[PDB]
Design a protein around this motif. Structure first.
Motif, PDB file in Angstrom:
ATOM      1  N   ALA A 157       4.543  -0.352   8.944  1.00  0.00           N
ATOM      2  CA  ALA A 157       3.307   0.341   8.628  1.00  0.00           C
ATOM      3  C   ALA A 157       2.911   0.215   7.170  1.00  0.00           C
ATOM      4  O   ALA A 157       1.958   0.863   6.749  1.00  0.00           O
ATOM      5  CB  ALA A 157       3.422   1.812   9.005  1.00  0.00           C
ATOM      6  N   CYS A 158       3.606  -0.587   6.391  1.00  0.00           N
ATOM      7  CA  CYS A 158       3.178  -0.833   5.023  1.00  0.00           C
ATOM      8  C   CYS A 158       2.089  -1.886   5.041  1.00  0.00           C
ATOM      9  O   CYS A 158       2.330  -3.004   5.492  1.00  0.00           O
ATOM     10  CB  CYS A 158       4.349  -1.305   4.173  1.00  0.00           C
ATOM     11  N   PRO A 159       0.875  -1.583   4.569  1.00  0.00           N
ATOM     12  CA  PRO A 159      -0.203  -2.557   4.637  1.00  0.00           C
ATOM     13  C   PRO A 159      -0.159  -3.607   3.560  1.00  0.00           C
ATOM     14  O   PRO A 159      -0.934  -4.559   3.630  1.00  0.00           O
ATOM     15  CB  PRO A 159      -1.437  -1.692   4.481  1.00  0.00           C
ATOM     16  N   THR A 160       0.706  -3.480   2.565  1.00  0.00           N
ATOM     17  CA  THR A 160       0.779  -4.468   1.499  1.00  0.00           C
ATOM     18  C   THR A 160       2.190  -4.971   1.265  1.00  0.00           C
ATOM     19  O   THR A 160       2.475  -5.504   0.200  1.00  0.00           O
ATOM     20  CB  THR A 160       0.218  -3.909   0.204  1.00  0.00           C
ATOM     21  N   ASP A 161       3.078  -4.814   2.238  1.00  0.00           N
ATOM     22  CA  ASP A 161       4.413  -5.397   2.200  1.00  0.00           C
ATOM     23  C   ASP A 161       5.208  -4.889   0.995  1.00  0.00           C
ATOM     24  O   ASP A 161       5.544  -5.640   0.086  1.00  0.00           O
ATOM     25  CB  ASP A 161       4.317  -6.922   2.187  1.00  0.00           C
ATOM     26  N   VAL A 162       5.497  -3.587   1.004  1.00  0.00           N
ATOM     27  CA  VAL A 162       6.414  -3.030   0.020  1.00  0.00           C
ATOM     28  C   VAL A 162       7.799  -2.910   0.623  1.00  0.00           C
ATOM     29  O   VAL A 162       8.714  -3.626   0.223  1.00  0.00           O
ATOM     30  CB  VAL A 162       5.951  -1.662  -0.484  1.00  0.00           C
ATOM     31  N   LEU A 163       7.961  -2.045   1.615  1.00  0.00           N
ATOM     32  CA  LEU A 163       9.285  -1.718   2.118  1.00  0.00           C
ATOM     33  C   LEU A 163       9.878  -2.890   2.888  1.00  0.00           C
ATOM     34  O   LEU A 163       9.170  -3.804   3.296  1.00  0.00           O
ATOM     35  CB  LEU A 163       9.213  -0.496   3.017  1.00  0.00           C
TER      36      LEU A 163
ATOM     37  N   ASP B 157       3.276  -3.303  -5.770  1.00  0.00           N
ATOM     38  CA  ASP B 157       2.070  -3.421  -4.980  1.00  0.00           C
ATOM     39  C   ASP B 157       1.799  -2.198  -4.143  1.00  0.00           C
ATOM     40  O   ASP B 157       0.919  -2.232  -3.288  1.00  0.00           O
ATOM     41  CB  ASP B 157       2.176  -4.649  -4.087  1.00  0.00           C
ATOM     42  N   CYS B 158       2.518  -1.117  -4.363  1.00  0.00           N
ATOM     43  CA  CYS B 158       2.390   0.043  -3.499  1.00  0.00           C
ATOM     44  C   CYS B 158       1.091   0.754  -3.786  1.00  0.00           C
ATOM     45  O   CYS B 158       0.941   1.367  -4.836  1.00  0.00           O
ATOM     46  CB  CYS B 158       3.556   0.988  -3.710  1.00  0.00           C
ATOM     47  N   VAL B 159       0.165   0.717  -2.835  1.00  0.00           N
ATOM     48  CA  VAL B 159      -1.157   1.260  -3.074  1.00  0.00           C
ATOM     49  C   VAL B 159      -1.162   2.772  -3.094  1.00  0.00           C
ATOM     50  O   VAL B 159      -2.048   3.373  -3.692  1.00  0.00           O
ATOM     51  CB  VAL B 159      -2.119   0.721  -2.013  1.00  0.00           C
ATOM     52  N   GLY B 160      -0.199   3.419  -2.462  1.00  0.00           N
ATOM     53  CA  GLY B 160      -0.187   4.862  -2.371  1.00  0.00           C
ATOM     54  C   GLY B 160      -0.657   5.423  -1.053  1.00  0.00           C
ATOM     55  O   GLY B 160      -0.627   6.634  -0.879  1.00  0.00           O
ATOM     56  N   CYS B 161      -1.056   4.579  -0.113  1.00  0.00           N
ATOM     57  CA  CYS B 161      -1.536   4.998   1.199  1.00  0.00           C
ATOM     58  C   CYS B 161      -0.388   5.618   1.958  1.00  0.00           C
ATOM     59  O   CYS B 161       0.440   4.908   2.523  1.00  0.00           O
ATOM     60  CB  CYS B 161      -2.060   3.794   1.955  1.00  0.00           C
ATOM     61  N   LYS B 162      -0.376   6.928   2.052  1.00  0.00           N
ATOM     62  CA  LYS B 162       0.786   7.628   2.580  1.00  0.00           C
ATOM     63  C   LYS B 162       1.065   7.310   4.027  1.00  0.00           C
ATOM     64  O   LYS B 162       1.973   7.900   4.588  1.00  0.00           O
ATOM     65  CB  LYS B 162       0.607   9.132   2.395  1.00  0.00           C
ATOM     66  N   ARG B 163       0.352   6.387   4.666  1.00  0.00           N
ATOM     67  CA  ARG B 163       0.664   6.027   6.039  1.00  0.00           C
ATOM     68  C   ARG B 163       2.064   5.463   6.181  1.00  0.00           C
ATOM     69  O   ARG B 163       2.587   5.422   7.288  1.00  0.00           O
ATOM     70  CB  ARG B 163      -0.344   5.011   6.561  1.00  0.00           C
ATOM     71  N   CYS B 164       2.680   5.020   5.092  1.00  0.00           N
ATOM     72  CA  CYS B 164       4.045   4.521   5.167  1.00  0.00           C
ATOM     73  C   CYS B 164       5.002   5.606   5.578  1.00  0.00           C
ATOM     74  O   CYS B 164       6.030   5.317   6.184  1.00  0.00           O
ATOM     75  CB  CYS B 164       4.481   3.954   3.821  1.00  0.00           C
ATOM     76  N   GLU B 165       4.693   6.853   5.248  1.00  0.00           N
ATOM     77  CA  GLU B 165       5.555   7.974   5.587  1.00  0.00           C
ATOM     78  C   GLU B 165       4.887   8.973   6.515  1.00  0.00           C
ATOM     79  O   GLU B 165       5.414  10.064   6.708  1.00  0.00           O
ATOM     80  CB  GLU B 165       6.046   8.677   4.325  1.00  0.00           C
TER      81      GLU B 165
HETATM   82  S1  SF4 Z   1       2.047   4.038   0.282  1.00  0.00           S
HETATM   83 FE1  SF4 Z   1       3.584   3.477   1.672  1.00  0.00          FE
HETATM   84  S2  SF4 Z   1       2.565   2.210   3.078  1.00  0.00           S
HETATM   85 FE2  SF4 Z   1       1.302   2.333   1.359  1.00  0.00          FE
HETATM   86  S3  SF4 Z   1       1.865   0.677   0.099  1.00  0.00           S
HETATM   87 FE3  SF4 Z   1       3.066   2.340  -0.537  1.00  0.00          FE
HETATM   88  S4  SF4 Z   1       4.861   2.116   0.611  1.00  0.00           S
HETATM   89 FE4  SF4 Z   1       3.383   0.903   1.593  1.00  0.00          FE
END
Ligand code: SF4
Ligand code: CLA
Ligand code: CLA
Ligand code: CLA
Ligand code: CLA
Ligand code: CLA
Ligand code: CLA
Ligand code: CLA
Ligand code: CLA
Ligand SMILES: CCCCCCCCCCCCCCCC(=O)OC[C@H](COP(=O)(O)OC[C@@H](O)CO)OC(=O)CCCCCCCCCCCCCCC
Ligand SMILES: CC1=C(C/C=C(\C)CCC[C@H](C)CCC[C@H](C)CCCC(C)C)C(=O)c2ccccc2C1=O
Ligand code: SF4
Lengths: 142, 293, 146, 81, 75, 75, 61, 30, 146
Positions: free
Chosen positions: D20-26, D47-55
Motif C-alpha cells: 500500500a505504499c504508493p511511492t515504494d518506501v517500505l 520519498d515518503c510522501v506522508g500519505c498515512k494509507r501505509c498504516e
Molecule cells: S506515508 Fe506510508 S504509504 Fe505513504 S509514502 Fe510514506 S510510507 Fe508510504
C-alpha cells in the motif's frame, strides 16, 4: 550478489498526441523519471497525466516528473496487462539512478539480504514521553 | 483644557484627522468638539481619568509624555543589557521562587499601592479642592493642616474629621472639607463617582496587607515558610487525595507552561472583575454620564 | 506543452521573437529603454483622464505626476528582483538551445549586471515615455478624444 | 528522514503496508519473530510522501508501522513543478 | 441564485409593480429607489434587507405569524 | 469592486465619483439596443403580430387591472 | 545614432545599489515636497472646512 | 502642516522601505 | 451574549424606558426586533445617496466587519486539497505564457497548510466579529448619546 541493475538504454516512446500534464521546469533543474517496459502487443492504456496513449511493440520508454506517477502507472501495467517494468531517476547533469525493484525482486516478497533500516524492537506504547527528550536532538521514536 | 471647563457638553477629542482622500462634505462633518478641522472623539475615557487623578492643563500632559517616553528608553536598555555576559542571570536566579514572591508581594504589589496613596493625598485630593500642587512647590503645602503628627501620636482619628460637604463642586473650594482619609462609601453627588477620600484610604489599607503578606517565605534569613514544605505537609489522612500535593513544587517550578497557565487564569478572572465593578461603581469623575465611554 | 496554432505559427513566432524582451542578441541597456518607452507613454492616459482631478485644469499635470511615480515604483520592484534573483558573478539562467537545436548564447539580460542595466533602461525610458505623452497631448493636441 | 517511518516488533508480517505504499518506501525483510517469519522495513524514507494509507492497513492492536511528519522537502511535498 | 431572486424582488417592486391612480399616475411599491440605492453595498442593507424585513419582523399576532417564526427558525 | 468603489466614494463625500446614472455612467447599450428591436418588431420584422411579444420591451404602454399594474416597459 | 544617444544618457541610473538609494530617498523627498506644497484648492483636507460646525445631540457632548 | 508630512512618510515611504528591506532578508541565501 | 445583555439593559435605562427591556427580553424576536433591528437605524444611514454624517466612518467599518467575517468561512469550510490542485494549473499557466516566463518564483507556491487555514480562518472570523459589534456598539449609543 547477483544485483547488476538494468542500465537504461535509449528506446522509442509510445505514440501520444502530447498533453499538458508532461514535465515542467522541475525537470530541467531538479530531476525527472523514466519507466521502461516491454510489451508483447500494441494496445491502448491510460496515462497518469490524463488521456490515453497506445503502447507499441517491445521496448517502450516514458518520462514522468515524480515517483508517485511512475509507480501509479507501474501498478496498472503489472496488474491489467501482466507486464514487467522498472523506473529510474535522471539528474540534470545526466547521471541516471536505478530505482524500483532495487534488487530485481518487487518489495512485496522477501529477499535474503536486504537491510533493516528504520525499526524499533518494542511495542508502540513503550515510547518515551516528551520530557525525556527535551533539549536534545532526539525524538520519542528515535 | 476646554473639556475640564464643562465635562457634560464638550466631546473629548482623541486626535486629528488628515486623510487626503476626504472630500469636502466629510471635512465638514468630522469637524466637531470645538476644533478647527476633522477630529476623532475619544471614547477610551482617558479624559475623565486624568481629570480625577489631578492633571489640569496641557503642560502636565507634555511632561507626562516625556517621562513615559524616557521610561520606555530605559526599558529598551535593560532588554539589551541583560543579554551580554556578566549581566545575564543564571538559572538558579530565575528558579528562586521564594525570594521572588517576597519582593513581588511586598515590593511590587505593596509599596506601589502605598505610593499611589501618597499621590492621591498630595496632588489629587488637593486638586479637587482648588489647590494646585506640583513638583515646584509640593514641599510647602500640607496634606492636612496638622499633618505628620496625628499619625505618629496614635490618634489617627483626625484625618477623617471634616470631609467634603454634600454640596461640592469638583474643581473648586466650595464645600471642600479637609479630611484626607475617610470612610463614606456613597457617591460624589455632583460627578456620580466614588469619593476621592475613600479611594485614598483603600489603597492605603491594601498597601498594608501586601507588605505583611510579603514576609512569608524564607529567602536568606532563616525565618519564614518553605513553599516546598507546605505542599508536602498537606496530605489528607485517609488517602482520599492520594499523596496529595507532594512533588507539585518541582513540577510547577520547572514547567514554564504551568506558570503561565496559572498567571492567565488569575489574570483572566480579575479582568472580568474589573469590567463588572467599573460600570457599577464609576471610579472616575463624570464618567457615568458619558454613556458611550 | 502542446503545439497549437496559438503557441506556434509563423505570424506568432515572428511577433514575439522580435520585441525587446526576446531580441536576445542586443545590449540589455537598450532593451530596457524601449520597454520603458512603450510602457511609459501608455499609462499616462488613464491617470490623466480618470484620476481624481480630471475635471480640474490640472488634469494634464496630475496624470503625468501619477504615471511618473508608477514608473518609479516598478523601477524599485524591478531592482528588488534583480538583486534577489541573481548573484554578482553567476552566469545566465536563460535557455541556450533554440527549437532547431542550435546552441546559442545565453541571454545577457538574465544576469545581475545585465538586469541592473535593463532597469536603467526601463527607468530612463519610463519617464521619457511619460513626458512625451504630456507634450503631445497638450501641445499638438487637436484630433484626440480627450 | 524527511518524514520518519518506524516499524515496531508487533508486526505480524502480513505485507499489507508494503503493498500500500504508493511511492515504494517500505519493503519486506526476513525475521524470526513471527509465524510468518518476516517483518517489514523502511529503508527509503526519503520519498515518503506522508500519505498515512501505509498504516491504515496495519491490522494490529494499535499499530506496527508508524509515521511521524517532520520537515518537508521538494519530494516529500509532492511538487511536480 | 440568491442574488438573482434578490435582484428580481427589488427591481419589480421598485420599477414595475404597485398601485395605479385613477388619474393615471403610477406609484410603485418602494417608490422607485432601485436606480439609485442598489449601487452601494450599504444600499442593499438599508433599503432592501432592513426596510423590507419590517413586515416579517412585526408579523406577530396576525395570520402572518407563522412566517415570523419560520424566519427565526430558519436562522 | 465597482460596488466597493461606489461605497467608498459615497462614504467619503464624493458622490460625483461613484458609478451611477448621475455620475460616471455605465449604460448597458446592448440590452438597450435589443430592447429597442423587440419594440419595433410589430412594425416590420413581424407584420402579423398586432403588438410585441411582451410589455417589458422598451416601448408601449402599461396594462392596468383593478388598480394594480400588470406590466410596463422595464428600463 | 539612437544607440549612442540612449547609451550615455541612462548610464547614471544603472548601478543597482545606487538606483535603489536614489529612488527611495529622492522619491520619499518628492512625496514630502508635493504634499507639503500642494494647493489647498486641489486637496480638500489641505484647506480647512471654513464652514460652521453642526452641534451634536444632547447639547454638544 | 506637520501632519501633511508625517502622514505620507508613515503611510507611503516607511512601508515601502520596510517591505523592500524584508524582501531581501527573507530571500537571502548563504 | 454577555455584552449584548449589558448594552440593551443599559440602553433602555439611559432613555428611561425600562419597560421595553422587561417585556421584550423574554422572546427571541424581541431581541432581534427591538435591539438589533431597531437600534441600528441611525448607524446604517452613515452615508446614503442623499448625504453623509459623522456616523459614516462607523457605517463603513460596520460593513467592513461583515466582509472580513464572511471571508473567514472560506478558510474554515473549503479545505486544502482543493486549492492545491488549483495552484498547480496556475503554476503551469505562468510557466508557458510568453513575456511572463521570464519571471520565476524563488520560493515555489503552495496552498496554506491544514493548521494554517484553521488559524487564518479563525483570525478573520474573530476580527470581523469584533469590528462589526464594536461599530454597532459605538455608533448606536453615540448616535443618541443616551
Ligand atoms: S506515508 Fe506510508 S504509504 Fe505513504 S509514502 Fe510514506 S510510507 Fe508510504
Ligand atoms: C522591590 C523589588 C522588585 C520590584 C519592584 C520588581 C518589579 C517587577 N519585576 Mg521583579 N524581581 C525581584 C524584585 C522586584 N521586582 C527580585 C528580587 C527578583 C529575583 C527573584 C525578581 C525577578 C523578576 C523576574 C524574573 C521578572 C521580574 C519582573 C518584574 C516586573 C513585572 C515588575 C516591574 C518580570 C518582568 O517584567 O521583567 C522585567 C520578570 O520576568 N522580576
Ligand atoms: C510612598 C508614599 C509616600 C511618600 C514618598 C511620602 C513622602 C513625603 N510625605 Mg507623605 N503621605 C503618604 C505617603 C507618602 N509620603 C500618605 C499615604 C499619607 C497619608 C497619611 C501622607 C501624609 C503626609 C503628611 C500629612 C505629610 C507628609 C509629608 C511628606 C514629606 C516628608 C516626610 C517626612 C515627604 C515628601 C510631610 C511633609 O512635610 O510633606 C509636605 C507632611 O506634613 N505626608
Ligand atoms: C504610585 C506612584 C505614583 C504615580 C504613578 C504618580 C503619577 C503622577 N504623578 Mg505623582 N506623586 C507620588 C506618586 C505617584 N505619582 C507621590 C508619592 C508623591 C509625593 C512625593 C507625588 C507627587 C507628585 C507631584 C508633586 C506631581 C506628581 C505628578 C504626577 C503625574 C505626572 C508624572 C510625572 O510628571 O512624572 C515625573 C516624575 C518624576 C520626575 C519623579 C520620578 C520618580 C521615580 C524616578 C519613579 C521611579 C519609577 C521606576 C524607576 C520605574 C522603573 C521601571 C523599570 C523596572 C523598567 C502623574 C499622574 C505631577 C502632576 O500631577 O502633574 C504635573 C506633579 O507635579 N506627583
Ligand atoms: C482607462 C483606459 C484608458 C484611457 C482613458 C486612455 C486614454 C488615452 N489614450 Mg490610451 N491605452 C490604454 C488605456 C487607456 N488610454 C491601454 C490599455 C492601451 C494599451 C497599450 C492604450 C494605448 C494607447 C496608445 C498607443 C495611445 C493611447 C492614447 C490615448 C489618449 C487618446 C485616446 C484616443 O484618441 O482614443 C487618451 C488620453 C494616444 C496618446 O497619444 O495618448 C496621449 C496613443 O497614441 N493609448
Ligand atoms: C442569471 C441571471 C441573468 C442573466 C444571465 C441575464 C441575462 C440577460 N438579460 Mg436579464 N434579468 C435578470 C437576470 C439575468 N439576466 C433578472 C433577475 C431580471 C429582473 C427581472 C432581469 C431583467 C431583464 C430585462 C428587463 C431584460 C434582460 C435582458 C437580458 C439579456 C441582455 C441581452 C443583451 O444585451 O445581449 C445581446 C448581445 C448582443 C446583441 C451582442 C453580443 C441577457 C441575456 C434584456 C433582453 O435581452 O431582453 C430580451 C432585457 O430586456 N433582463
Ligand atoms: C432575424 C430576426 C427576425 C426574427 C426573429 C423574425 C421573426 C418572425 N418573422 Mg420575420 N423578418 C425579418 C427578421 C426577423 N423575423 C426580416 C429582416 C425581414 C425582412 C423584412 C422579415 C420579414 C418577415 C415577413 C415578411 C414575415 C415574417 C414573419 C415572422 C414570424 C414568423 C416571426 C415572428 C411572418 C409573420 O408575420 O409571422 C406572423 C411574415 O409573414 N418576417
Ligand atoms: C505608539 C504610539 C503612537 C501612536 C499609535 C501614534 C499614532 C499616530 N501619530 Mg504619533 N507620536 C507618538 C506615538 C504614537 N503616535 C510619539 C511618541 C510621538 C513623539 C515623537 C509622536 C509624534 C507624532 C507627530 C509629530 C505626528 C504624529 C502623527 C500620528 C498619526 C499618524 C501616524 C504618524 O505619522 O505617526 C508617526 C509616528 C512617529 C514618527 C512616532 C514613532 C516613534 C497617528 C494617529 C501625525 C498626526 O497627527 O497625523 C494627523 C503627526 O503629525 N505623531
Ligand atoms: C496611507 C497613506 C496614503 C496616502 C498619503 C495616500 C495619498 C494619496 N492617494 Mg492613496 N491609497 C492608499 C494610501 C494612501 N494614499 C492605499 C492604502 C490605497 C489602497 C486602497 C490607496 C489607493 C488610492 C487610489 C486608488 C488613488 C489614491 C490617490 C491618492 C492621492 C489623493 C488624490 C489626490 O488629490 O491626488 C492629487 C495628486 C495627484 C493626482 C498626483 C500624485 C502625486 C504623487 C503621489 C507624488 C494621494 C497622493 C488617488 C490618486 O492621486 O491617484 C491618481 C487615486 O486615484 N490612492
Ligand atoms: C474547589 C471546589 C472543590 C473542592 C471543594 C470541596 C472539597 C471536598 C468537599 C468534601 C470533602 C470530604 O468529603 O472529606 C471529608 C472526610 C475526609 O476527611 P480527610 O480524609 O481529610 O481526613 C479525615 C479523616 O480521613 C482522618 O481523620 O470524608 C468523610 O468524612 C466521609 C463523609 C463524607 C460525607 C459528608 C460530605 C458530603 C459532601
Ligand atoms: C483561498 C485559500 C488558499 C489560497 C491562499 C493562498 C494561496 C495564499 C493567499 C494569497 C496571497 C498571499 C494573499 C495575501 C494577502 C494578505 C493581505 C497577506 C498578508 C500577510 C489556500 O491555500 C487554502 C488552504 C487550505 C484551506 C483553505 C484555503 C483557502 O481557502
Ligand atoms: S501492515 Fe503492519 S503488520 Fe502488516 S506487514 Fe506492515 S507493519 Fe507488519
Amino acid at each position: 550478489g547477483f544485483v547488476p541493475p538494468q542500465l537504461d538504454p535509449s528506446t522509442p516512446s509510445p505514440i501520444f498526441g502530447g498533453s499538458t500534464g508532461g514535465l515542467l521546469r522541475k525537470a530541467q533543474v531538479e530531476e525527472f523519471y523514466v519507466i521502461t517496459w516491454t510489451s508483447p502487443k500494441e494496445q491502448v492504456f491510460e496515462m497518469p497525466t490524463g488521456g490515453a496513449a497506445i503502447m507499441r511493440e517491445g521496448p517502450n520508454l516514458l518520462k514522468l516528473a515524480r515517483k508517485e506517477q511512475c509507480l501509479a502507472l507501474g501498478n496498472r501495467l503489472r496488474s491489467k496487462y501482466k507486464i514487467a517494468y522498472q523506473f529510474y531517476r535522471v539528474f540534470p547533469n545526466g547521471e541516471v539512478q536505478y530505482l524500483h525493484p532495487k534488487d530485481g525482486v518487487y518489495p512485496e516478497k522477501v529477499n535474503a539480504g536486504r537491510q533493516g533500516v528504520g525499526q524499533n524492537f518494542r511495542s508502540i506504547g513503550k515510547n518515551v514521553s516528551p520530557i525525556e527528550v527535551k533539549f536534545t536532538g532526539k525524538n520519542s521514536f528515535d | 483644557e476646554s473639556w475640564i471647563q464643562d465635562p457634560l457638553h464638550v466631546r473629548p477629542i482623541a486626535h486629528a484627522i488628515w486623510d487626503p482622500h476626504f472630500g469636502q462634505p466629510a471635512v465638514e462633518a468630522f469637524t466637531r468638539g470645538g476644533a478647527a478641522g476633522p477630529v476623532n472623539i475619544a471614547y477610551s475615557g482617558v479624559y475623565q481619568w486624568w481629570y480625577t487623578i489631578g492633571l489640569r492643563t496641557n503642560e502636565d500632559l507634555y511632561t507626562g509624555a516625556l517621562f513615559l517616553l524616557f521610561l520606555s528608553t530605559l526599558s529598551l536598555i535593560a532588554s539589551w543589557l541583560h543579554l551580554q555576559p556578566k549581566w545575564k542571570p543564571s538559572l538558579s536566579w530565575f528558579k528562586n521562587a521564594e525570594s521572588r514572591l517576597n519582593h513581588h508581594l511586598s515590593g511590587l504589589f505593596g509599596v506601589s499601592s502605598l505610593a499611589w496613596t501618597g499621590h492621591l493625598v498630595h496632588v489629587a485630593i488637593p486638586a479637587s479642592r482648588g489647590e494646585y500642587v506640583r513638583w515646584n512647590n509640593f514641599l510647602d503645602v500640607l496634606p492636612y493642616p496638622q499633618g505628620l503628627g496625628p499619625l505618629l501620636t496614635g490618634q489617627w482619628n483626625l484625618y477623617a474629621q471634616n470631609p467634603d460637604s454634600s454640596n461640592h463642586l469638583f474643581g473648586t473650594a466650595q464645600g471642600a472639607g479637609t479630611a484626607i482619609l475617610t470612610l463614606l462609601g456613597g457617591f460624589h453627588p455632583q460627578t456620580q463617582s466614588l469619593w476621592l477620600t475613600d479611594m485614598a484610604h483603600h489603597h492605603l489599607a491594601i498597601a498594608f496587607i501586601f507588605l505583611i503578606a510579603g514576609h512569608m517565605y524564607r529567602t536568606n534569613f532563616g525565618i519564614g515558610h518553605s513553599i516546598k514544605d507546605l505542599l508536602e505537609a498537606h496530605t489528607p489522612p485517609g488517602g482520599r487525595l492520594g499523596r496529595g500535593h507532594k512533588g507539585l513544587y518541582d513540577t510547577i517550578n520547572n514547567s514554564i507552561h504551568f506558570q503561565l497557565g496559572l498567571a492567565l487564569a488569575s489574570l483572566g478572572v480579575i479582568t472580568s472583575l474589573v469590567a463588572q465593578h467599573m460600570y457599577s461603581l464609576p471610579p472616575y469623575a463624570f464618567i457615568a454620564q458619558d454613556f458611550t465611554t | 506543452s502542446l503545439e497549437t496554432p496559438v503557441t506556434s505559427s509563423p505570424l506568432v513566432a515572428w511577433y514575439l521573437s522580435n520585441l525587446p524582451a526576446y531580441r536576445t542578441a542586443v545590449s540589455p541597456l537598450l532593451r530596457g529603454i524601449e520597454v520603458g518607452l512603450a510602457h511609459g507613454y501608455l499609462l499616462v492616459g488613464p491617470f490623466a483622464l480618470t484620476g481624481p482631478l480630471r475635471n480640474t485644469p490640472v488634469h494634464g499635470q496630475a496624470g503625468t505626476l501619477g504615471a511618473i511615480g508608477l514608473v518609479s515604483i516598478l523601477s524599485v520592484c524591478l531592482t528588488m528582483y534583480g538583486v534577489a534573483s541573481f548573484n554578482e558573478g553567476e552566469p545566465s539562467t536563460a535557455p541556450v538551445l533554440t527549437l532547431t537545436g542550435r546552441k546559442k548564447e545565453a541571454d545577457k539580460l538574465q544576469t545581475a549586471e545585465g538586469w541592473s542595466q535593463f532597469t536603467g533602461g526601463f527607468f530612463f525610458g519610463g519617464v521619457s515615455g511619460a513626458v512625451w505623452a504630456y507634450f503631445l497631448l497638450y501641445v499638438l493636441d487637436l484630433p484626440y478624444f480627450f | 528522514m524527511s518524514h520518519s517511518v518506524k516499524i515496531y516488533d508487533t508486526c505480524i508480517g502480513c505485507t499489507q503496508c508494503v503493498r500500500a505504499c504508493p511511492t515504494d518506501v517500505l519493503e519486506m525483510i526476513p525475521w524470526d519473530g513471527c509465524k510468518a517469519k518476516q517483518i517489514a522495513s523502511a529503508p527509503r524514507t526519503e520519498d515518503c510522501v506522508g500519505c498515512k494509507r501505509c498504516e491504515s492497513a496495519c491490522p494490529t492492536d494499535f499499530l506496527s508501522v508508524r509515521v511521524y511528519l517532520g520537515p518537508e522537502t521538494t519530494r516529500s511535498m509532492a511538487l511536480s513543478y | 441564485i440568491s442574488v438573482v431572486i434578490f435582484h428580481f424582488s427589488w427591481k419589480m417592486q421598485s420599477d414595475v409593480w404597485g398601485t395605479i391612480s385613477d388619474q393615471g399616475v403610477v406609484t410603485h411599491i418602494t417608490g422607485g429607489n432601485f436606480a439609485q440605492s442598489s449601487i452601494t453595498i450599504n444600499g442593499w442593507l438599508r433599503d432592501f434587507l432592513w426596510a423590507q424585513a419590517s413586515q416579517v419582523i412585526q408579523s406577530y399576532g396576525s395570520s402572518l405569524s407563522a412566517y415570523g417564526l419560520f424566519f427565526l427558525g430558519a436562522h | 469592486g465597482l460596488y466597493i468603489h461606489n461605497d467608498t466614494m459615497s462614504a467619503l463625500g464624493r458622490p460625483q465619483d461613484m458609478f451611477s446614472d448621475t455620475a460616471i455612467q455605465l449604460q448597458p447599450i446592448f440590452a438597450q439596443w435589443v430592447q429597442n428591436i423587440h419594440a419595433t418588431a410589430p412594425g416590420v420584422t413581424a407584420p402579423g403580430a398586432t403588438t410585441s411579444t411582451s410589455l417589458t420591451w422598451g416601448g408601449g404602454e402599461l396594462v392596468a387591472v383593478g388598480g394594480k399594474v400588470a406590466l410596463l416597459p422595464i428600463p | 545614432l539612437q544607440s549612442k544617444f540612449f547609451n550615455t544618457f541612462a548610464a547614471p541610473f544603472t548601478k543597482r545599489g545606487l538606483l535603489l538609494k536614489f529612488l527611495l530617498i529622492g522619491g520619499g523627498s518628492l512625496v514630502a515636497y508635493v504634499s507639503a506644497s500642494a494647493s489647498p484648492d486641489l486637496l480638500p483636507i489641505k484647506k480647512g472646512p471654513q464652514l460652521p460646525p453642526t452641534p451634536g445631540p444632547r447639547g454638544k457632548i | 502642516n506637520l501632519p501633511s508630512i508625517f502622514v505620507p512618510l508613515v503611510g507611503l515611504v516607511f512601508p515601502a522601505i520596510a517591505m523592500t528591506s524584508l524582501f531581501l532578508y527573507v530571500q537571502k541565501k548563504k | 451574549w454577555v455584552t449584548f445583555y449589558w448594552h440593551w439593559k443599559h440602553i433602555t435605562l439611559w432613555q428611561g424606558n425600562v419597560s421595553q427591556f422587561n417585556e421584550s427580553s423574554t422572546y427571541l424576536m424581541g431581541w432581534l426586533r427591538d435591539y438589533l433591528w431597531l437600534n441600528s437605524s441611525q448607524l446604517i444611514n452613515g452615508y446614503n445617496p442623499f448625504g453623509m454624517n459623522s456616523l459614516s466612518v462607523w457605517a463603513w467599518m460596520f460593513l467592513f466587519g461583515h466582509l472580513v467575517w464572511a471571508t473567514g468561512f472560506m478558510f474554515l469550510i473549503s479545505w486544502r486539497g482543493y486549492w492545491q490542485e488549483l495552484i498547480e494549473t496556475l503554476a503551469w499557466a505562468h510557466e508557458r505564457t510568453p513575456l511572463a516566463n521570464l519571471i520565476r518564483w524563488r520560493d515555489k507556491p503552495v496552498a496554506l497548510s491544514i493548521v494554517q487555514a484553521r488559524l487564518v480562518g479563525l483570525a478573520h472570523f474573530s476580527v470581523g466579529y469584533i469590528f462589526t459589534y464594536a461599530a454597532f456598539l459605538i455608533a448606536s449609543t453615540s448616535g443618541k448619546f443616551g
